[PDB]
Amino acid sequence: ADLQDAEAIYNKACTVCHSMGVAGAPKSHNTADWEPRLAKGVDNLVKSVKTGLNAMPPGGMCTDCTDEDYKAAIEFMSKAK
């Protein structure tokens, strides 16, 4: 796919699960779901993404993804997760 826009990255990748909340995924736009993430910081969740959590593919479903577009994508939502 395409690594030009944080919006395009989340909207194509963090979309299957997080858009509706399928597989128990936490929402794109919550406050209480992001609170216990923003309490640590930002670049702590980018890691659990690149690593692939249990129900989550390694890379968060992106292959060639750089921390730049990665974090921009996390911060497009609510700068935690």
Residue numbers at the binding site for ligand HEC (CB under 6 A)? 10, 13-14, 16-18, 23-26, 37, 45, 48-49, 53, 55-57, 60-62, 73-74, 81
Angle at 69 between CA 65 and CA 70, to 5 degrees: 70
Phi/psi for 10 (5° steps) reads -70, -40
The nearest distance, CB 44 to ligand HEC, in angstroms, is: 8
The nearest distance, CB 4 to ligand HEC, in angstroms, is: 14
- Chain-centroid distance, C-alpha 56: 10
The nearest distance, CB 40 to ligand HEC, in angstroms, is: 9
